[PDB]
């Protein structure tokens, strides 16, 4: 069942690329964070990470991830994965590319595995903010209340409702490939991979090879030192540059598709209700900012809504053709008068 | 019993950043001239506005100003912060007002 | 001294409960939190979770903790709790089902050890607000200042302020015992309990007994399998079946009840007088939004009461009859003219 | 080249102090931190713990720390150095008695270590914000933009722009030291320091000296259990009693000294210029507050300055002298009439 999905499995493979804040500067990231999603009801969020979560090398090993260190990746566990905000989130699922997680409020996030010895973290400055469903502007989601039509990102994966490009990458830099054959600048293969490679001085003009040598130039600072490696593919980031031979095509199927779920929505403490000759008498008792509106069916509307934080009473002139009122997300009331 | 005591000192940041009064006076104003006339088509003149500086760059030789406006944006007390100018009335030296 | 608690250290049960947010939904967790009682100054707050914390299960403890995974009580050390806010918590003390903890601002409260295999955490909405006892709207108990008497819960646990109700614990329910043996269903009994059978096809609906098998029935799904563990005792949860008998009795104490301590309060920085014909000209420079009141001495009150936050210079009025003002948490003063 | 500041690894030793809040209470905690400098731009903060960390015992191990645990240091691992605030910070680097991190605006800053099987915080309350340099009061540094002459502490280390006094510590109690000699309270020595000694009854009066017995008094709470401890001196701390003798040398180099760096700030999206007969129509939307500020080019300036949050619309009467308007931190632009 979980192994029916290996257009993003086996023919994608993590890079890395800017991360904006990685550690305390701007360094390369394995984690580099792309297409913060805040969009969903509950503060349900979904990241696009440059590291690949979810199987191991071949099918297996859910909980493991691949990240790229250098030139070549190490599948390892899961241990210590955790994305943060101005409060320390819990994650839900890891997939491909993406995680999804239930983060508090906050205007920054974070996301940071553990490998053992390092930390390996990245953060971007993206505000995330919670969007009570309804009428009722809470904080957190409650554990009663009446649910309604909320939207919100599902944690299935197996879903094909929308897809991404995953071109042949771009080719890579490694000054490490730019040994020293003794005087000269020395170049080596990791598998047999495409070493695009020529010097400012004039010499191989190409590279398309095993290990080569140079002739010309002396310094590892001018030289190209590239890695064509598109044997595995990778997403269409604006991070890493693009390969001028062609574009390929591999789309795969995004995990986390929108949903029009069911929410529980928070419920306000009922209205204590009080009369005088055709005149409501209105006490509110809120806990949390929640809107009032009102209706008077006559031929004139006459509506009248506000949000109200503190305790208040209000009032009604309640005419003969009679009036409605909407305290919360309680269904609606309506009156007659003397 | 304990003997306390403190002082203020100039915090490590006075180094770089720190406010600057100045009172200023009238001075006296500069312009850079490029003149294109005749057949020469070029001059770089830097001159002053006193009625009574020649400015002598390749050929011609010119006198500038003074100027018919005594206009100073500049108050009499100015306060300058690393790179905005700004005319607050800074009250004077070892006068200042706790707080403030 | 420690082992003078034995009603509760010893007869009660660790219990589990339906948490609302258990890591991302509601899942049954052996640390559902209930009743949580942030109504102190200082920020100390005090949360009755559904485990029980201190005592080992071989009579008493305190760096050990006693939770419920399965039908039995695996106890283990005490290592990694956690008790979260908008900002992670300082824990202060733990006591059976009670914990007193110290948290910063913040609308949600979550507990949680981390056992290592697993995490078994729990949360719940409920809003954490922390006034500090005094004139002045501060945030965090500063290193110095006047004090005042505040309002806050002991660390000591010796006490019997006040009791709480714990009786038989009801009919667990646990699907695990319908085992089948190719021909019928067989119930089993780990130690000393007495199972409940009760079965959809028309059989012995009643089925109270030790270790036994279904007369007819086949289907698991068809079937019930209520557990008795009526040796110990739980609490009077909200979330956990009645017992269809008697309330049993024992009072157990609530650990940290609430005192009049003395907690340190803010000082507000010195405001600067500056006399004037009939008029008290005041500088004032504060720190935190403090509260100012002043009032004339005359036979007119005349009460003037205004929080001030960003540093301002007030005046006031004052006449022959005299003025007064507390500025802050320093003490009252008074003012002539001539 | 790290080993050219020996007169802060040598010369100065670990410290201990009054932390406000140590954990639930004002213990004595070993990093006791003090004069935190939270005045840069880019959100970084320099801290002053008591505990010094640099060095190992003699001149290795950079990624160790150094604190005094009772009468002696201890020079441990780093591993798990938290400074926390309203959101957990991320560690820079650390020199001496200074730890250089960055952390989330909030309201106290808090530092704490591990030395295994103790947890070993401290906190205290101090204001924490930082508002970026520029028009544009964003909260967290971006991707991209603009570059502006910020003030920030410097990364590196190796400074000597300003410079901190370390005299001879004063002496500190310890009344383990007051060992027991079946009848008689029995002084010992850390390593032949010297040790004040005195009790309330008549008896040895200065103590200068190896390990004593007291011939007079008998309980230990009533006797000096001094410790004059001047081998390695300290930093005249608030919190360390003065050295009657003399504030000796070891004039000290402060480690991270502010400096006017280059950081990088937000850019607003440009302004829908929209024209009128002889007045300006600016439709605009910020993502963030930015204040906008116009003038105009004739004899009255009639300068406007207006922080905006929410998108509107806003006109200005652009006389035949000419308008000029800065929507955040763009270049200026100026502007006709006809
Ligand atoms: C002094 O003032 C005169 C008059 O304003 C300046 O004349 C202008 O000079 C610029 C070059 O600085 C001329 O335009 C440029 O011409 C070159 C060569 O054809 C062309 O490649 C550029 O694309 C550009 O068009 C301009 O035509 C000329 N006159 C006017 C009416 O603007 C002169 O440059 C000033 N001299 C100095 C030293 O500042
Ligand atoms: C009606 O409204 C007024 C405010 O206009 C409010 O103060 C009062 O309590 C309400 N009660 C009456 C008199 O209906
Ligand atoms: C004094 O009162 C006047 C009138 O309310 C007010 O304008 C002024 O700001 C106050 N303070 C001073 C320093 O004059
Ligand atoms: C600005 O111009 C718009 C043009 O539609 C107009 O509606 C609006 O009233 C004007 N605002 C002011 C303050 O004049």
């Not at chain 1, 996301?111 to 469903?133: I, L, Y």
């Not at chain 2, 300058?80 to 706790?98: I, L, Q, R, S």
Request: with cysteine; proline share 7%; aromatic share 8%.
């Amino acid at each position: 069942d979980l192994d029916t999905h290996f257009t993003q499995y086996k023919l994608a493979r993590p890079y890395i690329a800017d991360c904006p804040n990685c550690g305390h500067s701007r360094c390369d990231s394995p984690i580099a964070i792309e297409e913060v999603r805040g969009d969903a009801h509950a503060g349900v969020i979904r990241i696009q990470t440059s590291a690949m979560f979810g199987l191991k090398t071949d099918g297996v090993d859910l909980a493991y991830m691949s990240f790229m260190n250098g030139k070549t990746q190490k599948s390892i566990k899961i241990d210590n994965l955790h994305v943060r905000t101005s409060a320390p989130c819990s994650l839900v699922s890891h997939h491909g590319y993406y995680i999804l997680a239930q983060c508090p409020p906050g205007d920054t996030v974070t996301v940071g595995f553990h490998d053992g010895p390092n930390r390996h973290t990245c953060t971007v400055a993206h505000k995330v903010e919670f969007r009570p469903v309804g009428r009722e502007k809470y904080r957190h989601p409650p554990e009663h209340g009446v649910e309604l039509p909320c939207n919100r990102y599902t944690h299935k994966r197996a879903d094909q409702g929308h897809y991404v490009e995953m071109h042949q990458p771009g080719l890579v830099a490694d000054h490490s490939l730019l040994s020293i054959h003794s005087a000269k600048v020395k170049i080596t293969v990791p598998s047999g991979a495409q070493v695009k490679y020529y010097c400012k001085c004039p010499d191989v003009r190409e590279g398309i090879t095993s290990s080569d040598h140079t002739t010309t130039c002396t310094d590892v600072k001018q030289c190209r030192a590239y890695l064509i490696d598109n044997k595995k593919w990778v997403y269409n980031s604006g991070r890493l540059p693009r390969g001028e031979g062609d574009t390929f095509k591999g789309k795969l199927h995004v995990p986390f598709v929108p949903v029009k779920a069911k929410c529980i929505a928070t419920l306000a403490p009922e209205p204590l209700v009080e009369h005088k000759h055709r005149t409501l008498i209105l006490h509110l008792h809120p806990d949390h900012p929640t809107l009032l509106t009102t209706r008077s069916l006559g031929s004139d509307a006459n509506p009248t809504r506000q949000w109200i934080e503190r305790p208040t009473t209000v009032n009604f002139t309640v005419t003969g053709e009679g009036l409605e009122y909407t305290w919360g997300n309680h269904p609606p009331k309506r009156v007659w008068a003397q | 019993t304990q003997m306390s005591e403190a002082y203020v000192e100039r915090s490590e940041e006075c180094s770089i950043d720190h406010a600057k009064a100045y009172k200023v006076h009238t001075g006296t104003v500069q312009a850079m001239v490029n003149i294109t006339y005749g057949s020469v088509s070029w001059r770089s003149a830097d001159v002053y506005v006193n009625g009574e500086t020649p400015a002598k760059i390749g050929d011609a030789k010119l006198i500038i100003g003074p100027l018919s406006s005594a206009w100073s944006p500049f108050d009499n007390k100015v306060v300058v912060y690393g790179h905005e100018v700004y005319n607050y009335d800074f009250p004077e030296y070892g006068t200042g007002k706790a707080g403030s």
